[PDB]
Design a protein around this ligand. Structure first.
Ligand code: ZN
Ligand code: ZN
Ligand code: ZN
Ligand code: ZN
Ligand code: ZN
Ligand code: ZN
Lengths: 269, 269
């Protein structure tokens, strides 16, 4: 029997790919999520993990008996190197356009963010993405019978996006939520509380927390799987249920408390 | 132990009032639904059953320890005498406005429908409603923390409306759906297939079936409780689960099949 993943697992430590629910499959690493949403008309790939994880994600798609060339759309949580890192490599293997919101596009085109990113100074360089479709803030990415809806989730980054869709096992159909990172982390310089440096940014982070808290949410997954206890719910170490309709609420409420603690830290220093 | 209700129960046969889920309570009869949605800021009453059921609904509210005078809004599924029959009586006891969609207002004001109602010729007279608020087709009725959303559901009548809201037991919160009647029943004269007599009516009935099928639906209740198997899910005869996320879909699909059978009957006669 396999050991499964730790919650402190390296971003590049391999994970056994596997079904999450229905036609939603996990194809990331122990430390970083990536999902494959499948149909007989083509698939949607969710995220690209790190710049080092591209070959793992492709091997994982194949391990499940799907072909990367059948992916017709790639979507992104947020424009940090640990989620966007292998996008260009994945676009080459799949031929699929990458969908992102307007505030993420320059970063995806440069392969590096600008000062609007809380983590600007600690960014790692990644390959520019050649073909990006700018998606509206509640736009829908459609491939055959698949429909993934964007939920704008700025705060951890300007371009952050959560995603929601329905997956079914027979007639038991569940609202999947891939909620973006909500951690109020930064480089050594950035101050969430300095509104004059980025007017409205922190308010929009608060708005994001409220929006994510309100989603219809049967099964939550997050870009860092440990942020939603993923490995306590699927795989060899699972001991809590996969489905928990309170998960988005609790995720957002925990992130609010942590955001407020970040504000207190900034006040003190 | 009480016997509970039959599925063929008389519209006026009394039912023991009881909790459905959380702050949603059943206060109707064995044959006809009525619901009370409660808060410490006031309540919302859903439906009025028959012209004979008013005293039962008031006694049932009191049986649960709520005061009719604390109801701040009354909402309606549809303008037939078996659901709207005690509205005026209930408005007097509660002081609450009644909310209905535009196509139901004349009927509520007359106490009788016109030929737009498939069942026009078999209507029974009821008391006119004095104070009606015309509600927009996706409007929300708000009382304190309560929020009931209207889902326009024409077909069985022009004014038909389904209702949805959230009820919680602790942190386990469920999307309640009071889906309107979807039966393609009529008096002896009406023909759903005679579009020239009512242009677009049947198409809108089909649109309603699709809309109801698509609702997020954890617990379904219907104006005739047997149409959703209510008494197989709550009360003394319960043997199936209260929560079934497939219920709206199955309800609407069964109604589509029955609508199509009505069309075949009309073709044959
Ligand atoms: Zn990040
Ligand atoms: Zn990350
Ligand atoms: Zn749900
Ligand atoms: Zn009716
Ligand atoms: Zn009826
Ligand atoms: Zn649901």
């Amino acid at each position: 029997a396999s050991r499964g993943c730790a919650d402190d697992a390296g971003w590049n430590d391999p994970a056994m790919p596997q079904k999450v629910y229905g036609n939603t499959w996990y194809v990331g690493t122990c430390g970083i999520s990536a999902l494959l949403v499948t149909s007989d008309a083509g698939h949607i790939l969710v995220d690209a993990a790190t710049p080092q994880a591209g070959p793992q994600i492709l091997a994982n798609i194949r391990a499940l008996g799907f072909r990367p060339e059948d992916v017709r759309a790639i979507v992104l949580s947020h424009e940090h190197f640990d989620h966007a890192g292998s996008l260009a490599e994945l676009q080459k293997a799949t031929g699929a356009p990458v969908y992102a919101r307007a505030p993420a596009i320059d970063t995806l085109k440069r392969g590096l963010p600008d000062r609007t990113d809380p983590q600007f100074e600690v960014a790692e360089p990644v390959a520019p993405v050649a073909n990006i479709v700018t998606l509206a803030d509640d736009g829908v990415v459609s491939v055959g019978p698949l429909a993934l809806t964007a939920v704008a989730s700025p705060g951890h980054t300007p371009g952050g996006t959560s995603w929601t869709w329905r997956s079914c096992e027979g007639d038991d159909c569940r609202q999947m939520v891939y909620a973006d990172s909500l951690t109020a982390i930064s480089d050594d310089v950035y101050r969430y509380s300095d509104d004059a440096a980025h007017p409205g940014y922190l308010a929009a982070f608060r708005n994001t927390l409220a929006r994510v808290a309100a989603l219809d949410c049967d099964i939550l997954v997050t870009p860092h799987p440990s942020a939603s206890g993923l490995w306590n719910r699927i795989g060899p170490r699972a001991a809590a249920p996969l489905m928990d309709t309170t998960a988005c609420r609790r995720y957002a409420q925990g992130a609010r408390q942590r955001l407020e603690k970040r504000l207190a830290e900034e006040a003190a220093a």
